[PDB]
């Protein structure tokens, strides 16, 4: 439609996505919790 918004459409870049600012400010890796889960998970819920 209106192209005055068009120049802006192609010159601005995304500093941080909505799926990528869900991480705080000094991020810590939580890759230990996958195995922590699938251990405690399976050790708990057996029916």
């Amino acid at each position: 439609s209106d192209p005055v918004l068009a120049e802006t459409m192609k010159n601005e870049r995304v500093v941080q996505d909505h799926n990528s600012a869900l991480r705080g400010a000094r991020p810590i890796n939580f890759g230990y919790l996958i195995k922590d889960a699938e251990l405690k998970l399976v050790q708990s819920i057996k029916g």
Binding site: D2, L5, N11, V15, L22, G24, I28, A37
Partner: protein, 906 residues
């Protein structure tokens, strides 16, 4: 005039007068050979044939003719002498003619055919002279020189070595000592220079200087040449300057001193004023010298250079095509290569890349070590959309130019452009793309270092931009901001007035994610100061940026800017999304106008993930909106497989489906407990996927967290919460810390984090309800019966929570249990003071407790009369009534006026 003249040195000047003898034997007929030489040599021929003069007089007059510019006259004179002196006396005449025709073949403004004719006549007369006297030094020297003039350098060197061997042998046979022949040494020196043996050449040229410091051709020219090729330009120039100073008429030396002037102006000047002065003097000397040597290819190439830098590209092409091209076969390959190079620069500047390619190629064909031309070819390949070919050219150059700064810059930028292209990221594995990134960084960083090493050269500040952009692509924003700021600090130094608004804005953006919003706003607005000329599309973005920093101090300007932006342009979603949050934070609204306008927003761009995340936040916040059962479908449809493998709405669905399972476990029926055993493992069946997609997502970490405070494995859990505190300042995570904490837990650690929630913020719904429910800390604290001042601290808690919720009567339909909590600790201060000892501090203390007890009775009445009250059985209502009230009415008065007597006793 044309001879070296130095005080104290020897001289090589010819005699200036000549007498001829006569048979009448009058010993004089003087000829001053500077003046009395007739323009027609036949006039002297008549005298020389008249007196039957000796041959040496013919030769002396001919050499005076030659050493006066009239070489053709001397030639014709000895050619007339050749019709007279028969037989063996011809030898010296042929020697003279050989050298005279060599001289003529050394002349400016010659053609291919004229030069070949002169060299042929030289070779012919040399054949004759060798036929007579094959051992005279003049003939051997002419042999070597003719070999030289025809480009047969190896043959010339071998011939001259054999001649020198022969001479030393003949001298050694008859006892004579062999002195070094200056001309054999000079030829050997020039030949070794041709063979790129610069050390040997230089030694011969220096020793020639010692043997004959007035030798012509000046060995100091060769000295300077070798000094230059051996990377000693200062000594080279010193040599050429000396040659010029001792013979101001030495044109070669004047050209060499001129080149030295250009070089020294370009490399010695410390400021623009000295540069313009010295360069103007060089250009002036160039004009003066050129006015008398207009066929000189070095001077013409200097003119090509000046007219290139003067923007006059048409004259560069004209010099090449009308002057240099016609005399091409008669000029040295390196000079011609530079001339072609400048012609190619001209074509490049005019945008003619086919012709510039052709010209740089022709330049390389006559000097493949022309570094400038090879860079020009690389750049032409860039302009011609031959990027991979240009990279091959530049890396082949890099093999032997590892330390060239411009090459490192160029290779770094080409690799950076590749790394940041999306097409390459779509066609090569991630590891390869990352190695490409680090190769770009290697090139750029070594350029930085090389330029910093020479601590007097200025870094092109774009390198910092590019390094910042490379680190930005791989999500390392600390180093990215560092390099962006380094870029601007170098950029404000050079022309502070015009730094791009982009760098100030983007530094402000990087500061926004850091936390400094006043500095971000500051630089955002120093950038709005300098916005562009036509279609200023940058204002929309700048105003949104300022309006988004202005959200938590002075959001009235958020109001203003967002409103005008959305009124001016409609499609900007990122504007009025945040505007409808400034909405919420201040509630200047009807909820119905909200749902109307957003549930208009929804479908205009259905597949925008962000507004999906806003309507997920629309139905789950502070006031009401309890069901959102369709929100199951909302946030499962946001994914719904069109764009699967994404986290936000996914973890929202997670949170809801785990909230279901607590209500599942509350039931006594085993079927729904086993059913909640599905709403509980759906959690860990999806949270695992979202930690797989992005480990550092903090909120998946609190997912696990809220399980353990709920599934009674808290020990491991408050570890994770202590960590997510490091990576979050949300009040939710830290009040969940004090949640998981409060259970099986002394008091100190609870009230700690609950006054940290207190002071972190000033929010008005979480605060009342949460610290209402968790004065419980001091309450259970007191179920341990610590002391009375902590009982009254729990009183503070209760009291304020009550007055808040009753005055905040907008949503207050949840709290009659709270009311009973406060009534309960009125009851529990007394029940603690019932078992007591008189030796306590008593005046003005527990009076208030009995007052509160009667107040709690009054509070009990209200909940007695209510029917909706399903907290405790109504029988047990009336029964706590009777029990705790038959005890207080017969116990509290007891204690009160029992302690009054101890007040009498103290």
């Amino acid at each position: 005039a044309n001879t070296i003249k130095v005080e104290g040195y020897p001289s090589m000047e010819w005699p200036t007068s000549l007498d001829i003898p006569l048979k009448a034997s009058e010993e004089l007929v003087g000829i001053d050979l500077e003046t009395d030489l007739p323009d027609d040599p036949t006039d002297l021929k008549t005298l020389l044939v008249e007196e039957s003069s000796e041959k040496e007089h013919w030769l002396t007059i001919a050499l005076a003719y030659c050493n006066h510019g009239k070489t053709n006259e001397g030639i014709r004179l000895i050619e007339m002498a050749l019709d007279v002196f028969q037989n063996s006396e011809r030898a010296s005449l042929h020697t003279f003619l050989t050298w005279a025709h060599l001289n003529l073949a050394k002349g400016h403004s010659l053609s291919v055919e004229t030069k070949e004719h002169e060299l042929t006549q030289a070779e012919l007369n040399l054949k004759d002279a060798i036929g007579f006297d094959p051992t005279w030094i003049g003939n051997m020297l002419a042999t070597v020189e003719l070999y030289y003039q025809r480009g047969h350098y190896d043959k010339a060197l071998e011939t001259s070595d054999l001649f020198v061997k022969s001479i030393h042998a003949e001298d050694h046979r008859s006892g004579r000592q062999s002195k070094p022949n200056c001309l054999f040494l000079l030829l050997r020196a020039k030949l070794l220079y041709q063979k790129k043996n610069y050390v040997a050449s230089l030694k011969i040229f220096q020793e020639l200087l010692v043997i004959n410091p007035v030798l012509q051709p000046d060995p100091r020219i060769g000295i300077g040449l070798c000094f230059w090729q051996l990377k000693d330009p200062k000594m080279a120039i010193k040599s050429w300057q000396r040659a010029l100073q001792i013979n101001s008429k030495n044109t070669s030396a004047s050209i060499l001193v001129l080149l030295g002037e250009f070089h020294n102006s370009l490399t010695d000047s410390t400021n623009d004023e000295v540069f313009k002065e010295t360069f103007s003097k060089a250009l002036s000397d160039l004009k003066n010298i050129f006015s008398e040597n207009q066929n000189n290819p070095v001077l013409l190439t200097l003119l090509q250079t000046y007219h290139y830098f003067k923007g006059d590209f048409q004259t560069v092409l004209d010099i090449y095509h009308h002057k240099i091209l016609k005399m091409s076969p008669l000029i040295a390959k390196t000079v011609l290569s530079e001339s072609s190079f400048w012609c190619g620069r001209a074509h490049y500047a005019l945008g003619d890349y086919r012709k510039s390619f052709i010209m740089f190629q022709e330049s390389l064909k006559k000097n493949e070590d022309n570094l400038m031309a090879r860079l020009g070819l690389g750049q032409t390949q860039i302009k011609s959309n031959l990027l991979e070919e240009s990279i091959i050219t530049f890396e082949n150059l890099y093999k032997t130019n590892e330390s060239l700064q411009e090459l490192n810059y160029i290779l770094g930028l080409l690799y950076a452009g590749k790394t940041l292209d999306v097409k390459t990221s779509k066609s090569i594995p991630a590891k390869e793309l990352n190695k490409l990134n680090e190769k770009a960084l290697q090139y750029l960083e070594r350029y930085i270092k090389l330029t910093v090493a020479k601590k007097n050269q200025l870094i092109i500040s774009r390198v910092y931009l590019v390094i910042s952009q490379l680190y930005e692509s791989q999500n390392q924003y600390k180093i990215s901001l560092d390099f962006l700021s380094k870029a601007l600090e170098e950029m404000e130094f050079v022309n502070k007035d015009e730094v791009p608004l982009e760098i100030l804005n983007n530094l402000a953006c990087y500061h926004f994610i850091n936390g400094d919003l006043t500095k971000a706003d500051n630089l955002f607005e120093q950038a709005k100061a300098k916005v562009s000329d036509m279609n200023k599309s940058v204002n929309i973005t700048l105003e949104y940026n300022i309006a988004r920093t202005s959200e938590k101090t002075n959001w009235e300007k958020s109001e203003s800017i967002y409103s005008q932006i959305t009124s001016s342009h409609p499609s900007y979603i990122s504007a009025r999304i945040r505007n409808l949050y400034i909405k919420f934070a201040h509630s200047k609204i009807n909820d119905s106008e909200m749902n109307i306008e957003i549930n208009g927003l929804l479908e205009m761009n259905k597949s925008d993930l962000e507004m999906r995340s806003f309507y997920g936040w629309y139905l789950k916040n502070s006031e009401e909106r309890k069901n959102s059962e369709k929100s199951t479908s909302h946030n499962k449809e946001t994914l719904v497989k069109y764009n699967s493998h994404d986290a936000y709405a996914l973890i929202s669905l997670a949170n809801l489906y785990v909230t279901i399972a607590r209500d599942g476990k509350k039931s006594r029926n085993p079927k729904e407990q086993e059913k909640s055993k599905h709403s509980y493992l759906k959690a860990i069946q999806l949270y695992q996927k979202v930690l797989q997609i992005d480990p550092f997502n903090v909120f998946a970490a609190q997912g696990v967290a809220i399980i353990f405070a709920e599934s009674k494995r808290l020990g491991p859990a408050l570890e994770i919460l202590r960590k997510i505190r490091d990576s979050l300042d949300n009040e939710d995570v830290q009040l969940n810390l004090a949640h998981c904490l409060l259970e099986m837990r002394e008091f100190g650690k609870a009230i700690e984090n609950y006054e940290l929630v207190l002071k972190k913020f000033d929010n008005e719904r979480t605060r009342p309800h949460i610290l209402n429910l968790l004065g419980r800390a001091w309450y259970s604290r007191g179920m341990k019966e610590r002391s009375v001042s902590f009982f009254q601290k729990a009183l503070e808690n209760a009291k304020t929570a009550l007055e808040l919720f009753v005055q905040q009567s907008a949503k207050n339909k949840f709290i009659h249990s709270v009311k009973f909590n406060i009534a309960l600790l009125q009851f529990q201060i007394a029940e603690t003071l019932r078992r007591s000892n008189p030796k306590f501090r008593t005046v003005q203390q527990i009076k208030d407790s009995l007052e509160g007890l009667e107040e709690g009775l009054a509070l009990f009445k209200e909940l007695n009369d209510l029917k909706e009250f399903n907290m405790i059985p109504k029988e047990e209502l009336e029964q706590r009534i009777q029990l705790g009230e038959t005890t207080m009415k017969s116990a509290l008065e007891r204690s009160l006026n029992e302690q009054e007597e101890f007040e009498k006793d103290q």
